[PDB]
Write the structure tokens for this entry.
Amino acid sequence: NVIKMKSSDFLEKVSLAFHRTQGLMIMKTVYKGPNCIEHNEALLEEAKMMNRLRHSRVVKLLGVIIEEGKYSLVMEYMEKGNLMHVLKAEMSTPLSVKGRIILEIIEGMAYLHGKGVIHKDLKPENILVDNDFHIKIADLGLASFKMWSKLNNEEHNELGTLYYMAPEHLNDVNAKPTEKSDVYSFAVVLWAIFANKEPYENAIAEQQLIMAIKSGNRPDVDDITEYCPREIISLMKLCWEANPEARPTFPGIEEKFRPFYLSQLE
Ligand SMILES: O=C(N[C@H]1CCc2cc(F)cc(F)c2NC1=O)c1nc(Cc2ccccc2)n[nH]1
């Protein structure tokens, strides 16, 4: 189960903090100011069910700081920051670690979809890396932490990439996300891994970009200088198909990618 951690346990709003017994952790204190004990029953329940998600490639919610007008979400430390951070970094990450990161993302996403979780906001900012270069899927924006997310955005507190978003979600906020909404996102994460930068230059995410994407525009494959195996380009094109029922399922992706990684990349 989850821990109902006290502020005291941590020796001297996102910040780093040392647990007396457990060790190193990251924390985002979402709430401050007045007390709102009316949501305090739910916030704990959302947290203990998010904690039910236990996979090697899925971030573990270690505990919650639930106190008088101060609410925090604590998780394990991922030393190497996020995926984009690792790719833009000075030391060039090799084709053998890239393909493994790709297998691990497939492993993590398939698990979530297994457990009925739809990420909704998959992107490199939500793919975290440990020292050994292993990844974990995170929900830093609380897109899946429904209660905690609005608590974070409320007026009683004192404190957005469209690039990875499926065309059916652009200009249509009332469309219910599917398992394929995560699959489009993945295909653009595939491109990002091989091009070592953000797609569609760096700007703007205005009505021009959005309309070009909904019509059929996808990231520039020819902007990948580095060697990219034929098979993984077929995959990104397959996954970012305009029609969601054209896009594969993650267990389907896994079935074809695992043998490929083994022979060609590992
Ligand atoms: O990301 C996660 N939890 C953060 C949220 C807020 C935050 C933002 C920060 F910038 C720094 C942080 F330390 C915190 N703390 C947390 O506990 C988290 N994902 C998962 C697994 C899962 C679930 C569904 C979809 C995908 C992934 N479990 N916890």
Summary: The chain has two domains: 1-77, 78-266. The beta strands are 10-11, 14-19, 24-31, 61-67, 70-76, 127-129, 135-137. The pocket of K8K is lined by residues 14, 26-28, 50, 53, 58-59, 61, 73-75, 112, 117, 119, 137-140, 142, 144 (CB under 6 Å). The first helix runs from residue 40 to 50.
